[PDB]
Amino acid sequence: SPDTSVDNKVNFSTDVIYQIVTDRFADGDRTNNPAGDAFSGDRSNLKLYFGGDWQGIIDKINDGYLTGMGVTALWISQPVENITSVIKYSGVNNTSYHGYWARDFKQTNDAFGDFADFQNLIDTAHAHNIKVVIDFAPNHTSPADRDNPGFAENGALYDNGSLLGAYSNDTAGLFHHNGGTDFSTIEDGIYKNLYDLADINHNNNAMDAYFKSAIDLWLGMGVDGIRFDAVKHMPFGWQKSFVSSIYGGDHPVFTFGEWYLGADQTDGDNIKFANESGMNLLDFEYAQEVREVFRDKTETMKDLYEVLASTESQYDYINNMVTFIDNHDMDRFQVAGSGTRATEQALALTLTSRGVPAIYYGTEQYMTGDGDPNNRAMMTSFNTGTTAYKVIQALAPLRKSNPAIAYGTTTERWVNNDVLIIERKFGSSAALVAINRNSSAAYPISGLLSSLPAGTYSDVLNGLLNGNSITVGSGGAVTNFTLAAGGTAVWQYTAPETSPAIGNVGPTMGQPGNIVTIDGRGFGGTAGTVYFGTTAVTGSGIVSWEDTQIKAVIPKVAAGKTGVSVKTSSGTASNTFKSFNVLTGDQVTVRFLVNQANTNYGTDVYLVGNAAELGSWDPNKAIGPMYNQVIAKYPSWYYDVSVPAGTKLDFKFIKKGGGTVTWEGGGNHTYTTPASGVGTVTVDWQN
């Protein structure tokens, strides 16, 4: 099957995701509706269950509402069994309608449906060439008070109905007992509770095995992708080990996490997580800037382009960014009393930009509402006639048919404070997008250049947003035209590639023997070579080959980041996909601890070692800076690190800072890592 097939679970940049809060979308089965104080019949209390369920999603696929839009993936509320108790929070009864208060990750939330309902949703979606993404929240269970067991359900955790433990009587050490976080540092937000949510201890072997087992069940039923909740509040090392076990399992899938960023904020740890964790990220820098430019008018088109360029240079895998313009935690894009063209233009930009676009349910019906839970009202209408519906219908399928939009580079061709003209290019295909946010003034466009070959191009939107046709001359020169007030147009050209061209490689990280997927154009029908760096993969090591997709087995090659490329059976080479990170083997998570390592202000302890996962003795690739506040206290330091299973590691600790790099004295430390799960090592500093 080709790169655009619904069967391609690891690469999503040809898709458009529709994000559904399950309880708030469509009640297709009133018999699974919660009863009593847990249900809001008149929808007065938006913290209660309203009744939306998987059957309702199934109905809106079959009757064509969701298919009519060109949407090709559905991202749904965490499917797992939640607590069924109603919690009073400052006078207001609250429920698990949102799906984030888990108690059994191996059972369904019966409000949404049973396991047969879930398999039907998967089946109806795939049958319509729609992928299914689930929220997954392994950070915590549910609200709990350690010193008052009676509150809620004490954050209890069941395994197929059998109680592994609760917060108040936690003899196995399943949870952290370190208080609640004040969000003051990243370390503080990982190893402590988020509000009153019982924080899982993933340095526990039973917890590592539990979540690996639980995710495999959902992936076994055909789930195509995972939205990891709260990735800022779990150890980076555990998450890298966790997604490496997915990529090495039977069901490699696209994964991405939520790492919130505020407006005008960039964060080095966010960047490092997106580039090194093996998991991708929701693109908050893009989302906040688009909101500023179109919704709030607190930035201009020039500022928007600057963010497009700075995200491109800082993120290694820009086609994996999941872009959006709002979600279930922000104010709705549509502001009561504003017009709808801001929504329309923001969608048009997002649907044609690099990455993986995601649309929050009801965006296309101009739903309004500020803050949680007002931004989670019941879907107001299924009107397929709104301009926004038709904008998505027109432009989402371009991601499947034009490889410039799914894979291509991004180049500004014209920019002032109100107008942005952007070109996407991939080999012989290209797309040109023009947007004028000024609602009372048209702008003449003169001397615009493009990569479009000569001829006359009609607007893909056909004037729905006051766009126009253009005439392109010899050198990609675009004949003078006027971009109308509020105007938005898309012009495109797609041509069959003749040279092999890689658009994406998924997953982005893997140990030898994993199956990776290479998507692009012009690979030929018959098998050729795949080049992990300088080493060739042919014959047995190619699982399947065709013109837009190759599946291949990672070869036993030096661990570390490397380029991936293909040569056709006619000996023709491709471009190289940058920074594929080969692992040494399967991963475990080890907590490394070092004592009596004192430092002055501005100097941090780091971990170096022999395996690539430990930097290969490069203090430039050292792991850290380590932590010293919560799990263990300065002058003790600790860090949770993804390292190869069953492996004799040699390592030392170092002290680096503004210039100086101090090394550990004596001989090396040595440790054989576990064959599965998680581990720990405690060492003394050596002067």
Ligand SMILES: [Ca+2]
């Ligand atoms: Ca229902």
Ligand SMILES: [Ca+2]
């Ligand atoms: Ca249909």
Ligand SMILES: [Ca+2]
């Ligand atoms: Ca945590």
Ligand SMILES: [Ca+2]
């Ligand atoms: Ca600003």
